[PDB]
């Protein structure tokens, strides 16, 4: 079957105020390019071709810029439908909405606004497939994540993640953030579930590249009380007595997917994408054929657009787009 990806271009962590005044959040220029672009190049890289974007607040400017998208060309591989709906302000409603129009056929990969990534989902995508149809819908979600170390500037003061998981099928066992918790709390629910080894981790990123399955649109419609993905996962992790059909977690090792949220996160991800940490994606590859993004990569990570007329004796040590 085709691989269709729901997508919302208004991450409701509405923190880029006042910056959100002039141009909306997603459209932001990180490295003189739209983040949403980065996301779309990602979607194309993992090879999905029917992407359903969504923007409620400021959808106008979104379409205004994305009409000339790298993937709004007729030659594109991705088809896009900016459903200009301004009712929801929580993803819950847009998921019940992709329920409300049977858009997702089956086995979709929902994604937040401005994930920076290079990840090939196909390994995951297929293992999801395996333990979902060689297991017949016992799954509902197979979280994907990226190994890291806590001290890195990827986990700003604001957001980290800590998670209990199994080690045999790698199914989720609990998910929770750690905004100032010198200790933690895990129930023996974990082990009265099974006596064959359980793992806790604090070295996964907030990758926010949840693979899912339209029965996720089910799990959102059948209960109108969820407003974010964390709502979803913790509700399903507590509602394991019946009708849980838990999440099958999975971590990568070689890629870089970060759902940029706050100005510090934008800082970190911009000055790591300049360092090519995500390559293929970097503006000298000019992946959006958009003209003025001709970036003549040069000595020692100094990038340089055309006609910069760089000043005499102006030293530039590194990473200067």
């Amino acid at each position: 079957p085709p691989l269709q990806a729901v997508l919302v271009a208004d991450s409701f962590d509405r923190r880029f105020f006042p910056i959100s005044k002039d141009q909306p959040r997603v459209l932001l220029p990180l490295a003189n390019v739209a983040l949403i672009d980065y996301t779309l190049e990602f979607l194309t890289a993992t090879g999905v071709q029917e992407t359903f974007v969504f923007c409620c607040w400021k959808a106008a400017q979104i379409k205004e810029h994305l009409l000339k998208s790298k993937w709004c060309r007729p030659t594109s591989l991705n088809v896009v439908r900016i459903i200009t709906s301004e009712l929801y302000r929580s993803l819950g409603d847009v998921l019940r909405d992709v329920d409300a129009k049977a858009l997702v056929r089956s086995d979709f990969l929902l994604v937040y606004g401005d994930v920076i990534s290079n990840i090939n989902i196909t390994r995951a995508l297929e293992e999801h497939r395996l333990r979902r149809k060689l297991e017949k819908n016992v799954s509902v979600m197979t979280m994907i994540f990226k190994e890291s170390s806590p001290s890195h500037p990827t986990r700003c003061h604001e957001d980290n993640v800590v998670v209990a998981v199994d080690s045999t099928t790698n199914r989720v066992l609990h998910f929770q953030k750690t905004q100032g918790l010198r200790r933690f709390a895990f129930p023996l629910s974990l082990f009265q579930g099974s006596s064959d080894g359980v793992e806790v981790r604090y070295d996964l990123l907030d990758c926010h590249i949840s693979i899912c399955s339209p029965q996720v649109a089910q799990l959102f419609t059948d209960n109108f009380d969820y407003q974010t993905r964390d709502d979803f996962v913790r509700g399903l992790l507590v509602n394991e007595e019946i009708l849980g059909n838990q999440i099958h977690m999975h971590v990568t090792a070689k890629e870089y997917g970060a759902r940029v949220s706050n100005l510090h996160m934008y800082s970190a991800v911009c000055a790591d994408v300049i360092r090519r940490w995500v390559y293929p994606l970097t503006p000298e590859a000019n992946f959006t054929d958009s003209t003025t993004q001709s970036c003549t990569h040069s000595r020692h990570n100094i990038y340089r657009g055309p006609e910069v007329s760089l000043g005499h004796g102006s030293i530039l040590e590194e990473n200067v787009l």
Partner: protein
């Protein structure tokens, strides 16, 4: 028509134009003679031009002029002359001659926009003399809005580097006139050396003003890549093996050379309006082109 006006005409041509390298002034005056030859023959004109070129060589001691004479002699009989009257020949001949003029004029611009993309930005360029072609290719690379410095030597016998500076700083480029004897010093701190040439030998190396070779050798030991520019006609069928071998019709004008030779082992990249080269390719090209 006699040899007096020929030599003085070369002199006048070079005087009204110090900006025209001696070779092309020679070739010009040569075409001028061919015009007013007032002869009607084929070989009887070959003899005239050979004698005239001998005189010009005996006036100006440059390799450029005599070499250009050789090449002009070649490029008047390049294909079937279509010998019909020994007069219309002259017409078509001098036509090909003015075409030769055309290519010789184009030479500089060709080599400039051929090379000015070879200078990585922010490095020190170390020329050696008043090499018109070097000045032009630099001027180009500047016009492309780059950044780089200039160290120039001064090629002691006559002040050349002083002149090159006085004319280059007119382009507002960082310039520094080393004392040519000091090449071994600044050789540590410039990456690559563009050097003007005044004649290419048939194995790839070049012949050039007094200091070239020693600079050359320094700029190889330290692996600092070594460039050179010279347009077409300054190819020559002279194959020395030792610095004593270079003919003495060039070496003068107590006893001190003016030009000397560098083995092609050292020259790392040519520059010829025929295109980028590789000294052995200068050989191949010379045997082919010369004809």
């Amino acid at each position: 028509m006699d040899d007096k006006e020929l030599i003085e005409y070369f002199k006048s041509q070079m005087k009204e134009d110090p900006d025209m390298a001696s070779a092309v002034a020679a070739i010009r005056t040569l075409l001028e003679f061919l015009k007013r030859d007032k002869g009607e023959t084929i070989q009887g004109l070959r003899a005239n031009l050979t004698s005239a070129i001998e005189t010009l060589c005996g006036v100006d001691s440059s390799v450029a002029v005599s070499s250009g004479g050789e090449l002009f002699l070649r490029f008047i009989s390049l294909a079937s002359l279509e010998y019909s009257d020994y007069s219309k020949c002259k017409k078509i001949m001098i036509e090909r001659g003015e075409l030769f003029l055309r290519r010789i004029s184009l030479s500089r611009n060709k080599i400039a926009d051929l090379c000015h993309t070879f200078i990585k930005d922010g490095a020190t360029i170390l020329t050696h003399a008043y090499s018109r072609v070097v000045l032009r290719v630099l001027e180009a690379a500047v016009a492309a809005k780059k950044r780089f410095s200039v160290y120039v030597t001064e090629s002691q016998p006559d002040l050349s580097g002083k002149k090159m500076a006085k004319a280059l700083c007119h382009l507002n480029v960082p310039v520094t006139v080393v004392l040519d004897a000091a090449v071994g010093y600044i050789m540590e701190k410039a990456d690559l050396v563009i050097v003007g040439a005044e004649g290419v030998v048939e194995n790839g190396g070049i012949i050039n003003k007094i200091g070239t070779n020693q600079m050359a050798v320094c700029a190889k030991a330290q692996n600092k890549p070594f460039y050179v520019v010279a347009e077409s006609f300054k190819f020559v069928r002279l194959f020395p093996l030792n610095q004593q071998d270079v003919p003495d019709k060039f070496k003068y004008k107590e006893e001190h050379p003016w030009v000397d030779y560098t083995a092609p082992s050292l020259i790392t990249l040519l520059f010829t309006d025929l295109g980028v080269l590789t000294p052995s390719a200068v050989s191949d090209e010379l045997i082919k082109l010369y004809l």
